Amino acid sequence: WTATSGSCKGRCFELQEVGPPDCRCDNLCKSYSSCCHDFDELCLKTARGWECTKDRCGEVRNEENACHCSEDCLSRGDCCTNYQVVCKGESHWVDDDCEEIKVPECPAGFVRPPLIIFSVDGFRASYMKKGSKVMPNIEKLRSCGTHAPYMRPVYPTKTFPNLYTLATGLYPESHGIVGNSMYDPVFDASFHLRGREKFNHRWWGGQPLWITATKQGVRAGTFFWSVSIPHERRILTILQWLSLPDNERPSVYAFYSEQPDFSGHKYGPFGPEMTNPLREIDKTVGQLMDGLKQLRLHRCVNVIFVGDHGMEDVTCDRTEFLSNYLTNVDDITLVPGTLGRIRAKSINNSKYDPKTIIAALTCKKPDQHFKPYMKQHLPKRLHYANNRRIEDIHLLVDRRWHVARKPLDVYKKCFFQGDHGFDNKVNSMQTVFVGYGPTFKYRTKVPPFENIELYNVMCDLLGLKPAPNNGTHGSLNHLLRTNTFRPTMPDEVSRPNYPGIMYLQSEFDLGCTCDDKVENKLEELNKRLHTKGSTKERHLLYGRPAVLYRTSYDILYHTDFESGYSEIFLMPLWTSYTISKQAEVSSIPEHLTNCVRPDVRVSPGFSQNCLAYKNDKQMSYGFLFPPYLSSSPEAKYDAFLVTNMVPMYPAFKRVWAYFQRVLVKKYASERNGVNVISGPIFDYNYDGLRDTEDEIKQYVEGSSIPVPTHYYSIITSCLDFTQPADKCDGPLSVSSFILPHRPDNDESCNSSEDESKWVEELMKMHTARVRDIEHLTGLDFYRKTSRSYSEILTLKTYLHTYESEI
Numbered sequence: 001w002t003a004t005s006g007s008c009k010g011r012c013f014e015l016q017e018v019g020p021p022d023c024r025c026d027n028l029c030k031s032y033s034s035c036c037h038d039f040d041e042l043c044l045k046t047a048r049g050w051e052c053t054k055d056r057c058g059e060v061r062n063e064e065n066a067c068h069c070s071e072d073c074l075s076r077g078d079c080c081t082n083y084q085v086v087c088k089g090e091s092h093w094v095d096d097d098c099e100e101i102k103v104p105e106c107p108a109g110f111v112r113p114p115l116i117i118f119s120v121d122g123f124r125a126s127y128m129k130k131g132s133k134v135m136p137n138i139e140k141l142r143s144c145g146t147h148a149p150y151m152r153p154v155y156p157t158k159t160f161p162n163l164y165t166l167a168t169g170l171y172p173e174s175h176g177i178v179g180n181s182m183y184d185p186v187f188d189a190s191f192h193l194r195g196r197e198k199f200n201h202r203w204w205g206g207q208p209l210w211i212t213a214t215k216q217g218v219r220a221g222t223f224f225w226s227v228s229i230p231h232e233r234r235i236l237t238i239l240q241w242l243s244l245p246d247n248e249r250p251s252v253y254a255f256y257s258e259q260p261d262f263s264g265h266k267y268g269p270f271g272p273e274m275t276n277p278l279r280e281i282d283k284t285v286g287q288l289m290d291g292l293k294q295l296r297l298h299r300c301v302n303v304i305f306v307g308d309h310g311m312e313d314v315t316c317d318r319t320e321f322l323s324n325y326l327t328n329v330d331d332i333t334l335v336p337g338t339l340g341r342i343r344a345k346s347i348n349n350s351k352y353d354p355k356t357i358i359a360a361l362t363c364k365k366p367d368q369h370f371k372p373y374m375k376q377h378l379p380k381r382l383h384y385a386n387n388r389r390i391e392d393i394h395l396l397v398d399r400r401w402h403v404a405r406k407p408l409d410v411y412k413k414c415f416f417q418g419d420h421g422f423d424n425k426v427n428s429m430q431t432v433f434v435g436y437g438p439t440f441k442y443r444t445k446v447p448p449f450e451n452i453e454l455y456n457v458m459c460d461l462l463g464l465k466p467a468p469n470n471g472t473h474g475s476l477n478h479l480l481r482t483n484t485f486r487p488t489m490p491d492e493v494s495r496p497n498y499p500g501i502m503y504l505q506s507e508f509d510l511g512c513t514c515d516d517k518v519e520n521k522l523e524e525l526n527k528r529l530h531t532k533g534s535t536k537e538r539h540l541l542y543g544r545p546a547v548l549y550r551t552s553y554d555i556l557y558h559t560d561f562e563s564g565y566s567e568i569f570l571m572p573l574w575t576s577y578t579i580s581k582q583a584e585v586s587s588i589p590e591h592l593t594n595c596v597r598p599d600v601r602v603s604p605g606f607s608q609n610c611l612a613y614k615n616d617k618q619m620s621y622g623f624l625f626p627p628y629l630s631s632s633p634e635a636k637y638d639a640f641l642v643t644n645m646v647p648m649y650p651a652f653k654r655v656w657a658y659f660q661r662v663l664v665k666k667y668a669s670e671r672n673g674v675n676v677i678s679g680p681i682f683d684y685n686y687d688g689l690r691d692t693e694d695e696i697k698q699y700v701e702g703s704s705i706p707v708p709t710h711y712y713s714i715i716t717s718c719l720d721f722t723q724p725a726d727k728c729d730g731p732l733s734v735s736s737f738i739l740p741h742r743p744d745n746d747e748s749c750n751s752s753e754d755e756s757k758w759v760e761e762l763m764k765m766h767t768a769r770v771r772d773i774e775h776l777t778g779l780d781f782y783r784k785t786s787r788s789y790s791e792i793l794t795l796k797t798y799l800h801t802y803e804s805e806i
């Protein structure tokens with residue numbers, strides 16, 4: 001209950017929230033059924049509209065008007081935004097030439113340039129080019145400020161997950177808003193778009209920008225507008241807040257538009273009805289910029305124009321029905337649409353089996369437009385697993401499609417022609433970023449980046465220390481003229497050992513054999529040098545990775561590769577090798593097929609053994625440095641060292657072999673040489689972070705050899721591909737992957753065919769950022785380059801998406 005018979009007199013859009021049963025006058029009282037009786041009358045005025053006209057100029061103030069054209073309006077801070085244009089002969093902001101903003105040009109008493117976040121729902125990245133003719137204000141912001149060709153949202157590419165990721169710098173798995181609908185089993189409560197529950201604070205984890213600001217003495221406008229409050233009134237409210245006294249005035253503001261998303265759902269992303277929504281959003285940007293110009297703030301405020309996700313063509317007839325695959329379709333609860341999430345309808349059902357549900361949805365129709373996953377098997381780049389609110393069974397839905405439980409759900413819930421929520425690398429899901437103001441660069445294009453990075457930057461813009469988040473602070477320093485954050489490289493925690501020859505062959509009882517006894521100061525001195533690291537500059541191009549946790553490991557040098565060998569996990573943490581464009585692929589000689597050789601640098605006690613692999617009928621093995629890429633028949637012997645071996649399911653060996661035998665050479669040909677770093681990853685609790693030894697759930701049978709959940713490779717070359725990877729004078733180019741180490745190839749419906757028809761497709765799906773691999777390994781790469789650290793941070797955040805051009 002709220003006693004709503006108090007008044008909003010002088011309280012319209014008050015910044016501090018009053019506690020019930022006192023009536024509220026803040027911009028979210030509507031959503032709480034808590035506004036004072038006179039909120040509409042006083043705070044939602046509309047009389048005479050939103051624009052000054054010639055006849056209204058110099059009028060006598062009438063307090064009933066929506067906005068004012070009287071002489072006193074500027075000092076009262078409540079002119080219509082076009083006041084100076086119509087009444088004072090001024091030009092619209094959009095009609096003025098852009099001029100570099102080298103320093104903040106602010107009124108006396110402004111302690112820092114304000115930040116205004118202008119968020120637009122469903123604003124697809126290609127609208128910038130395709131709607132450019134009807135968006136002159138936005139187009140001016142874009143060309144004169146700092147812009148990216150697109151900005152990558154988070155998965156799922158829905159509204160709240162993305163807006164709250166903007167506010168926190170966190171993955172949805174961490175902030176807790178994992179979809180537009182959720183069930184939380186601990187709370188035993190559900191979150192929905194409609195309803196009051198979404199306003200309960202227990203859903204919203206992390207620390208959003210307004211809280212970060214408040215705790216550090218920076219005041220914030222509200223980050224919620226009631227849907228029925230018109231956009232003109234939202235703008236006038238922000239402009240009114242900017243006229244407050246210094247001690248009362250916020251430094252950070254948010255505007256939000258429900259468009260173009262709203263129309264996009266109805267008409268599709270490029271429906272002819274879409275021109276009007278884009279026109280109208282532009283006009284709002286115009287009103288803001290004119291209003292700022294009036295208040296002498298258009299060269300003071302930093303403006304961020306940002307979308308939450310894009311929009312795809314999706315219609316009712318492109319729906320897959322779970323009723324066409326499952327027999328027990330009524331024992332499941334499905335969160336439907338552009339993604340699927342499945343759980344048991346009742347916890348009291350002991351006959352519910354996720355394994356039989358997955359199997360029944362796997363590769364069952366020729367052109368099947370979704371793929372089932374246990375959430376821990378989803379591409380790691382999605383970071384979509386570590387939350388009790390994400391159901392164990394997930395369906396990745398093809399772009400342009402829906403999934404639903406039964407056909408009756410679709411006609412008794414065609415209306416809609418647009419939707420979104422798909423995989424966040426899908427081009428149609430990409431959205432926008434422009435930054436304009438004294439703190440952003442002038443007329444600058446930056447590479448596409450992920451929305452998880454903006455929180456740090458907004459903190460930088462406001463002089464705030466960001467809460468712990470998933471951005472990489474410094475990766476976006478190139479967006480900024482000033483206020484850059486100067487990060488330092490993390491300190492190495494564990495220094496390596498450099499073992500020499502310390503064990504005789506006969507001390508090993510590993511059950512390994514090799515035909516290598518087939519036996520000169522020419523090549524005996526030469527092989528000594530290779531084992532001491534004479535080739536290390538060729539194969540370790542960017543310095544050795546740093547180990548950022550406490551562990552025991554050895555550097556091992558070889559002619560063709562270098563590794564950091566973990567005595568704890570009994571395998572390399574990393575293996576580094578360079579393959580030039582001229583390099584030759586050879587095969588494993590017949591006499592060396594099953595060869596594994598003890599490493600006389602590493603004790604039997606800290607080695608793997610061949611018997612374990614023989615005994616384990618499921619688990620086989622592979623090699624991190626590929627024998628196929630040996631520089632000579634003699635060097636090849638090095639690749640069969642027990643210290644280069646890793647556990648691999650036969651199913652996975654098909655993938656790995658094709659990558660090593662075919663794709664490495666192909667990349668070296670295309671990229672003019674590549675440096676490769678490969679290794680294992682253990683993430684049994686699917687939290688995106690390196691497992692400790694006590695978190696491992698699977699070992700090679702009868703041994704302490706742990707089984708990786710994934711294999712990574714980081715593949716680096718020169719951005720200027722006219723220079724070979726090993727002689728690159730400038731910027732680097734990278735692509736990486738984190739392949740799941742699975743005992744079947746069920747993920748790939750065409751795996752019964754030759755690896756040339758399915759493997760690369762799998763690898764692209766599991767593309768990754770270096771940073772993703774960093775989290776998962778506790779390693780820090782690119783320690784020794786000729787490049788600035790911020791440029792290297794940008795490199796580490798890069799995701800090779802394999803999509804076509806935007």
Ligand SMILES: *[C@@H]1O[C@H](CO)[C@@H](O[C@@H]2O[C@H](CO)[C@@H](O[C@@H]3O[C@H](CO[C@H]4O[C@H](CO)[C@@H](O)[C@H](O[C@H]5O[C@H](CO)[C@@H](O)[C@H](O)[C@@H]5O[C@H]5O[C@H](CO)[C@@H](O)[C@H](O)[C@@H]5O)[C@@H]4O)[C@@H](O)[C@H](O[C@H]4O[C@H](CO)[C@@H](O)[C@H](O)[C@@H]4O[C@H]4O[C@H](CO)[C@@H](O)[C@H](O)[C@@H]4O)[C@@H]3O)[C@H](O)[C@H]2NC(C)=O)[C@H](O)[C@H]1NC(C)=O
Pocket residue numbers: 170171173174175176202203204205206383386387388468469470687688689775
């Ligand atoms: C992306 O960036 C984020 C942010 O930096 C990274 O997430 C952080 O990672 C840390 C490492 O996992 C984690 O630290 C833990 O915090 C525990 C206390 O957490 C509370 O307090 C913090 C700080 O205010 C708060 O942010 C947390 O909020 C979480 O939980 C609430 C609900 O309870 C949600 O509203 C919110 O969304 C958030 O949930 C998310 O994180 C939790 C994990 O905390 C997940 O469970 C959720 O699914 C969701 O993703 C909390 O309110 C602290 O108690 C932990 O310490 C225990 O565990 C460690 C083991 O490493 C051990 O060393 C300690 O001794 C201690 O052990 C004891 O408890 C164990 C478990 O109960 C038990 O097994 C032991 O036997 C002991 O009894 C730990 O320090 C930090 O909380 C999160 N922060 C956030 C916001 O998510 C994230 O890793 C990044 N991702 C990537 C890929 O890089």
Ligand SMILES: Cc1cc(-c2n[nH]c(=O)n2C)c(C(C)C)cc1Cl
Pocket residue numbers: 198199200201204222223224
């Ligand atoms: C849906 C919604 C919820 C909340 C919200 N309510 N409680 C909470 O922690 N949050 C984050 C907010 C903030 C700005 C008040 C805005 C919106 Cl659009």
Ligand SMILES: Cc1cc(-c2n[nH]c(=O)n2C)c(C(C)C)cc1Cl
Pocket residue numbers: 117119160163164166167222223224225226254255256
């Ligand atoms: C920019 C932005 C807008 C909104 C937002 N959502 N709805 C609304 O009116 N606003 C203002 C939110 C909510 C989800 C906390 C967060 C951010 Cl970073």
Ligand SMILES: [Ca+2]
Pocket residue numbers: 121122158159160261308309
């Ligand atoms: Ca949205």
Ligand SMILES: [Ca+2]
Pocket residue numbers: 682683684685686687688689690691
């Ligand atoms: Ca882990």
Ligand SMILES: [Cl-]
Pocket residue numbers: 156158178179180181335
């Ligand atoms: Cl959802």
Ligand SMILES: [K+]
Pocket residue numbers: 613614615616617618619620
């Ligand atoms: K075996």
Ligand code: NA
Pocket residue numbers: 745746747748749750751752
């Ligand atoms: Na298959």
Ligand SMILES: [Zn+2]
Pocket residue numbers: 122261262265420
């Ligand atoms: Zn939408």
